[PDB]
Symmetry: D2
Subunit: 436 residues, 4 copies
């Protein structure tokens, strides 16, 4: 009680009853579980991104606007089905629905476009259809590739080569779907931007009762590496035909978030099912409850103990910023980023504070949805003559957007993360600011 007494008097007892804060202050994981309360309402914005598969049930512009409002952050196009013409029309409809909210940063919501490959099939490596689909992805400006059946590091090098010189910025998320992918996980993660636990094929390739071990191991290793991990397949399966999920399905979504997944996915639930919008809404509601139930006290301690020492100033600033945010219950960490990297390094420490990433790159704003707790703000103003003024203006844009969108309130403390010179790679400053 003495460690939270002054802040309880200042912020109030109602503040410390919400977002599972009594469970968050527990001294053991067992006590943390005992203190979880169904009446402790989540307050923070939902941090785990939702990937929705686009298909016949979720293709129209009107339906896509509803899905964006329900919480869809990434639109997945499964190239195992449909044609290039079909998927190009789906991409155009996603972009039209996204741009319908472009009138202001308060309404605008970047949505990433991910291409999920058909896979190698019976062949030992990159198929000819995958080469054509990957070229289609580059030509249509996709942000992410979910590479099917990645079994070794050379599979991801082949996907990278097939994206060519114009697709260097596309994120490659390797799908682990069989025994070989699980056994060679370390070499695959090393060369990938992230991982997808593709439980559909994994549950057929290895005994079904072992999938949870592979999921927990891969999520843990991605969390340790600071790289995005997606939990996928049959999360809310019964919602393909029913308006409400089973007890096992809500438990599965909550446990994927508690395991440490950066993203959760919907496949048949959004692509063909009768309730695509409701499936997104259900994942949104469960993820916010589960994020508040994360035991940050142990998680942050373990991420520090396991992470090696670093001489990279972005990494050093990120841990100092997350430590400062926890000390004052900061409402947000505002970070300036060109490629999304400074926001990714804050996200790896799993702050409770929202990471508001201010960027001029439309592609980086879409791709940062892969990192838990990163809320992208696309800045469109032309650069100021004095660089320091341009930096200040972007921070103020973050603060004003934050207040207008309810993330920030007068009296809140925010942590601001910036660098000492222009260009990517120079983040080295952390500032504590009081919102007025």
């Amino acid at each position: 009680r003495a460690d939270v007494a002054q802040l309880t008097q200042e912020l109030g007892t109602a503040f410390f009853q919400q977002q599972q804060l009594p469970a968050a202050m527990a001294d053991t994981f067992l006590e943390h579980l005992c203190l979880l309360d169904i009446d402790s309402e989540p307050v923070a914005a939902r941090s785990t991104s939702i990937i929705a598969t686009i298909g016949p049930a979720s293709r129209s512009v009107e339906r896509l606007k509803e899905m964006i409002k329900a919480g869809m952050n990434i639109a997945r196009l499964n190239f195992s089905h449909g044609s290039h013409e079909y998927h190009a029309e789906s991409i155009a409809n996603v972009r039209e629905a996204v741009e319908s909210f472009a009138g202001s940063p308060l309404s605008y919501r970047p949505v990433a476009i991910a291409l999920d490959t058909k896979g190698p099939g019976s062949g030992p490596g990159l198929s000819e259809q995958d080469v054509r689909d990957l070229r289609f992805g580059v030509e249509h400006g996709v942000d992410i590739v979910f590479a099917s059946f990645v079994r070794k590091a050379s599979d991801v090098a082949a996907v990278r080569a097939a994206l060519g010189p114009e697709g260097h910025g596309i994120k490659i998320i390797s799908k682990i779907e069989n025994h070989e992918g699980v056994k060679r996980f370390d070499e695959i993660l090393e060369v990938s931007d992230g991982i997808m636990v593709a439980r559909g094929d994994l549950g057929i390739e290895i005994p079904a009762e072992k999938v949870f071990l592979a999921q927990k191991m891969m999520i843990g290793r991605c969390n340790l590496a600071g790289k995005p991990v997606v939990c996928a397949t049959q999360m809310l399966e019964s919602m393909i035909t029913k308006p409400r999920p089973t007890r096992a399905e809500t438990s599965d979504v909550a446990n994927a978030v508690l395991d440490g997944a950066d993203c959760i996915m919907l496949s048949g639930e959004t692509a063909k099912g009768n309730f695509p919008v409701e499936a997104v809404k259900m994942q949104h509601a469960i993820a916010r409850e589960a994020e508040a139930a994360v035991y940050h006290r142990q998680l942050f301690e373990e991420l520090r103990r396991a992470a090696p020492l670093s001489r990279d100033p972005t990494e050093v600033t990120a841990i100092g910023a997350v430590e400062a945010a926890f000390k004052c219950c900061a409402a947000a960490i505002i970070v300036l980023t060109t490629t999304g990297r400074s926001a990714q390094l804050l996200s790896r420490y799993r702050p409770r504070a929202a990471v508001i990433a201010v960027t001029r790159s439309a592609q980086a704003a879409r791709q940062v949805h892969l990192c838990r707790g990163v809320f992208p703000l696309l800045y469109r103003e032309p650069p100021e003559a004095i660089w320091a003024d341009d930096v200040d203006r972007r921070v103020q844009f973050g603060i004003e957007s934050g207040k207008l969108r309810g993330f920030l309130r007068v009296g809140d403390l925010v942590i601001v993360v910036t660098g000492w010179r222009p260009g990517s790679g120079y983040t080295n400053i952390m500032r504590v600011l009081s919102i007025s």
Copy 2:
């Protein structure tokens, strides 16, 4: 041997942090220990036949649930008779015989304020037919438990009352309900309709954590393998749900439609068995034992004191089993609350206690049928030897293993006070 330390997720078990423990989980590290989380199967048309019940007992069913919301007293009396016939068909091999508990799940109060008249009649039927456990529906407060206990009468004092928490009031008054109950059931079906569906996992984790702290059994129930009512294999969310209920700390997991009315009752039991075994090896005992000891209050009860000493000793030598003599099951329950990796082999003469201890994780009941020896010390020894011989036959023990043996200083319940380290010959 090196092979010993590669099995049962032992590299993950030796990790210094929970994060590193997760990173070290290996799909090729095979489970070796016997499955410790009990399986409750609901009895219905898909699982009433004596021959089908024998297959369910072989697949791993430990408790048969009778849902009194369906069928007459004559229907439930026939269910009980068929379960007893299937169970007793294996009694000719005493070293391998598996006791099976019979649990009566009540209809509940309905729109009524407390114990309904139909529940009074069903509870009296349960006492007259010798049921072991009552799963009391919609328990909202301590007085609901007292009413169930009063309705069981003087002949039903030994029946365990597991309170089902199915609504907001039951969750809010959980502490007072747990205090007077023998255990709890997280009845997720009604709970997921009474409170927002997205909050059920919080109530499940909280109740399992509190029951683990109290050392009382907790059952996770409803829709765990729902798709197996019609499909031969479960969904990815269903296998995950079963594994996470075990990792959360549930003593028992349950099947409802999957065994009462579905096409795959035996396969549903086999699936829960396979997942539970994998998940039990993935438990991070280093943190769990540390937290259970730290949170458990000091005690002057010799059974409790001997139990923590025995569990600590079992971990020190990687004991294959803790063999305990018990009259009521209490000495085995107090060992189980510390979650040893060693199997707790409970030797008892009480057929009812042998059935009821299935409520406690990691307790393997052995019903001893031999008449007492004239010398009490020789009777205790023969029971310990029966535990060892059953253990060897069932694969729990081998020559060279170390076992912890827990006994008491005089006959009768309540006098457990001795822990002994024994080498299997």
Copy 3:
């Protein structure tokens, strides 16, 4: 590796002790300040220069003995010895002057204490060690006796009896810090209980983030012998391991035959003991127990100490007017030296009360642009650090500054690569 780094990486406190190595040489600068009592054996300017070189950070004047004229001459000699090194601003070492009161005797605040406290204000003393503090009102009386001109003087309450120990929380609340005055404490309470009072008071001061001094008979045999006993070296090392911000010498420097050697011995033991601190547990416990705060100086301090540990920073350079921003960094016990750049000569002297704070008195011409003036004070911290052996080219440092001039606005932490 050096500075007990194998013991520092251990997973348990037991394994940390098992890995302590007599051949692992200390590399960090000595963090625990040394307070030396000035008397007949340590009064001359020449002797005081040798004591400053040996490591004396605070000069204590015991008003239980001598006269106002005697102590004024001691103060003048300390100031002359200190200023003899002012010609090299990158290496100059400030030395605080502390006045230790006679006490209440058989009485609250005595009339002699009122006169001695007035003498302290008139002679610009930095600290008062208030004898026999037994309640919060004793501290208020000392503060009132210092008057309007003595508002900046630090009051370190000396706990010397049972009542002071029992009312410790109320005394610490209103004091700037505490002295565990073991001489009187060991006569007022059973001698075998003094270690419990010492460990409890050091622990509570560490929790409060306030300075604590361990005092009396630490190297007693060195009053007549050139080398201390085995118990004396152990006592000094254990006071540092307990968490003391300062260690003190009384008769050892005031009247003994080896005042310089006594200071050298405390310096050598403290350096060895500081490397043997188990920071892995200490930082985790200090971080867990320090309350949540909305004060930006407090928030920046924990972020800076966390960042320093992440990169093995050689130093945390902090700009401070009153010493407060450096004190808030010191409370988290970083392994990195806290180099405090200040223009206040008094703050530079007083900040010796906080473990791991190395004060640098800035006497360079001002810059017209405030951002440039801040930058030049940071470069001064770096150049003094390189000259003194704290920093080398290639090291990483954490820099702590504020958003506008004046005390109370520290809110920035920056990661900087040296040279």
Copy 4:
């Protein structure tokens, strides 16, 4: 119940703290020690402490081990000191409440290897039935093998405590500890052989490694040095004694303080008083957790029974752990886990009763009743003897819980049983 007063004594509020920092903050000068003093006191016997009357006062003050320093005196002089110690010890055999075994330890003069004088002094020790040898200047494992060989055919049961006194002994510590029964941190010579400011590092390291190995460690030299001429010690001296106990030392020692000083009895009394306060201040919650985590898994039933017994004693705040032992080994394995409960060791071996003073928290009871024909009755008689002596000495009262450690058959090496008994 135990009462609120019970939980205010023996630093129990500090014992229940969740962190080491909180534990320090909760230490209370008004929380009185209740447990018997567990750290043994070794007193050096010389001119100031040689008479039978003076030795009786030193035994009453708390001396557990009498050290005879063969760097001085002669064989005839030390034989008379041994005879006087034995006469003073046996003067209390008429009262069960005051009879206490006292070990006799021979400290060698020291050395290229084993000196001719050490061979003769070690032979004198065997002939006079000494319990322990403090071997001076042990630098390597072969030095211990030479001492062990010199202990001839009759002295293989004598405990060899290696004195670490120089840089080489510190650097080769692991190999020395492996072959020794225990260690002495001989700070006098160590503080001359290595820089004085590094001695505390060698002391803390050696105490930590001995605690991890489950072997006795003695802290020695200048602990209460000023008491050679003064009636009261300095503040640094009381701190040094308390910190040696908090570091994990099994024994603390007095040299010139008892051998030639003006206040030998007062020096023993001061060590007794400080050790009792310091033992209550030990943070058992972390200590037990770390000893358990660092100790390897074991298939030895004595080791397995010992950890189970210590865990059980902490669970019920047991007043004592009563153990039957012939060699002292079962008591030593309980002692390595540092229980707060007193370890009452009931033995028929007078030698083991004297030697177990090397292990912290072991209170030996020498049992001399003729053996019962039924072995289970002989075990029950010894257990009841431990209980009745415990009630007579103030360790136990009716209603207390005790943990009892025995084996399944007679003979040393078979301890495998832990029982919880309610005192009647």
